[PDB]
């Protein structure tokens, strides 16, 4: 859940 998120924040 909101792994996309925590994915962009953590690359971006």
């Known amino acids: ?3 996309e998120l925590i994915v ?3 690359l971006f």
């Open 1 to 3: 859940s909101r792994s």
């Open 8 to 10: 962009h924040q953590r």
